[PDB]
Symmetry: C4
Subunit: 90 residues, 4 copies
């Protein structure tokens, strides 16, 4: 489960990184950052400057948000929770 | 279900696109982008400049957020999930 | 239920409107807009300029987000849903 | 439960405050504000300027969001709810 969600999220982020670095001309790290803050809905970034960037962002959000949060929801419940939960056992 | 949510979301976005392009004077693509990042709570955009824009955005958020996420929640569970889930069957 | 959540949300927004208009010197409409985009996590606005603004925003977010989304969750399920749901009956 | 979530959230915020004040050179209050708006996904702030800031923010979001919202979810259901709920008893 966690393994699959991790892969799907990585591929989704790779796609966004490639898109934004090419169309918006961002350095890879910036393109990945943009992709990440977009899909987690944090949004700490100014918007894309090109229409392609805007259209892709619209579609990228609708298709990638469900996945990203599904992953986050498992990362904290099936992994981070026990780590400290089972650790809460005297 | 997915069909209905898709329609309600499209109409909600069309309304926002028409509103922002008229009142804020944005090109259609920008008005749609603004509507989308607003309702998905991504918020990668500077705020509206007019009071009408601000008031509408306030109301648009409260009335459209529940719908948009209801749609996203079905798009990833009733459509995108199986696509890869059933595909996870040897 | 919806009645109570509506009141609690209105009071929460009134408080934020009064705070931001006084401490950040924003016109009432702007202070309300800021309060709304903050609590719905949309965040389409530059940050407060004063330390009081920042500290209050930190606390305002933790105390008001649960309430605001509880309201939104009822506004779309107990009110907006049937309106179109029962209307989906031939 | 609430006690544990409160601690984990405080430590998560302390870490972010120390990181951003050191790497991005922000005053402590600004570093805490940035950490808070990032993890609650409010995002009312311009992005970090350094690559370290961006990389850390990416990881900080994935590891801290689940926790922060788990805390918020308990703060409004196990604490703020009754306060007004039990108070709704004639
Ligand atoms: K958000
Ligand atoms: K959210
Ligand atoms: K934002
Ligand atoms: K923003
Ligand atoms: K946001």
């Amino acid at each position: 489960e966690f393994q699959v969600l991790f892969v799907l999220t990585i591929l989704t982020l790779i796609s966004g990184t490639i898109f934004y670095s090419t169309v918006e001309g961002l350095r890879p790290i910036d393109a990945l950052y943009f992709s990440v803050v977009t899909l987690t809905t944090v949004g700490e970034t100014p918007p894309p400057q090109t229409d392609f960037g805007k259209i892709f962002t619209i579609l990228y959000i609708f298709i990638g948000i469900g996945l990203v949060f599904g992953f986050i929801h498992k990362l904290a419940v099936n992994v981070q929770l026990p780590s400290i939960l089972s650790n809460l056992v005297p």
